[PDB]
Amino acid sequence: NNXXXXXTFXXXXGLXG
Numbered sequence: 001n002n003x004x005x006x007x008t009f010x011x012x013x014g015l016x017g
């Protein structure tokens with residue numbers, strides 16, 4: 001789970017994001 005907020009992939013945390 002990559003992310004932790006917003007950007008290129010979208011918003012939240014989501015398995016290779």
Ligand SMILES: *[C@H]1O[C@H](CO)[C@@H](O)[C@H](O)[C@@H]1O[C@H]1O[C@H](CO)[C@@H](O)[C@H](O)[C@@H]1O
Binds near residue numbers: 011
């Ligand atoms: C994400 O958080 C909330 C979910 O209900 C809402 O305030 C908005 O949907 C918010 O979305 C933001 O991100 C998208 C791109 O991922 C933009 O299009 C929106 O304008 C907003 O900045």
Ligand SMILES: *C(=O)/C=C\C=C\CC(C)C
Binds near residue numbers: 002
């Ligand atoms: C979070 O992003 C951690 C691992 C992700 C692996 C990729 C997934 C198996 C498609």
